Design a protein around this ligand. Sequence first.
Ligand SMILES: Nc1ccnc(=O)[nH]1
Lengths: 176, 174
Amino acid sequence: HMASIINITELNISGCYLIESPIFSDERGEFVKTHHQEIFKNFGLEIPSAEEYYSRSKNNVIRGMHFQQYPDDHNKLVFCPEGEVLDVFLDIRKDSNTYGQFMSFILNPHNRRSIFLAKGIAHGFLSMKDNTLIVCKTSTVHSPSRDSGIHWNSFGFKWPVENPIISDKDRNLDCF
Amino acid sequence: ASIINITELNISGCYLIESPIFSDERGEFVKTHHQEIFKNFGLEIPSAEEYYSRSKNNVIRGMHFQQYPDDHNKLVFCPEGEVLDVFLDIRKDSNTYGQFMSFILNPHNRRSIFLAKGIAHGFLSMKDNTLIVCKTSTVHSPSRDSGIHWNSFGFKWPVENPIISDKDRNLDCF
Ligand SMILES: Nc1ccnc(=O)[nH]1
């Protein structure tokens, strides 16, 4: 595998992917390639392009676990170009072979990882540093009527933190 | 104030995008794109390629564009650090051919720049660890990848001894 291009690994949870971005470095700093449509298309993927936002999280924030319900369900693509997260996702697709399973990955500017998540995946993260940036794209726009979630502490994960900072909204999500 | 504002700029087909910010005890989130709001102005998010650069203080990168038929729209924001983003209209049938504009982008102003095909784009980094996230509507095409020399179009860069690649140092003058 050539370290000059974007490399994509489909994960045990089908429809989710680790994306490993290359880097070019010189006296000016760095350039990192995060998406290329031809590369993505081999995996049957298109970049989510309905909405984008970025979050800036204090240390020990947990945000999640979030997803949008059919028929406004969407693919989601995240990377962390500053700070660090432990990114966590749970397969909540009832008819999935990995239903109720989860995976997690540390994302940061050092490893240059992105995660692509299919529809029906619940997504969250733990900010492990102040000023942690997560840039996030979704394949359908935010749907207040279908926006949903599962409680961060309700699906078997062992979060390496004490007294995480968590929204009231996130605190009142239903248990998986 | 609470939603994405898009304003057309003097150089036509180019737009200033001003993102809203929402805050709580956890931090902030900033909406950079929504397809419907973009569509309200005739735009679509460039989505063939994305990359981000991280630049030391006093770096200049540019001026870059891709040539027809692989010319592309370009969208940039700065979520960390600061840049003076600069662009040149190089479209010969344009009423603003040869004119340029410049805009400070940073995470406080939350400004993004959308650029039309046929615009040469570059920036000057004003802070270490400056992040630019860039999207293009066609993928990189090395055969059509081209440029105009940063010091060749009238601009007074507010920097002494900028740090510039060999490539960029030897682009054709405008
Ligand atoms: N994919 C790329 C985009 C822009 N510049 C590059 O060198 N490569």
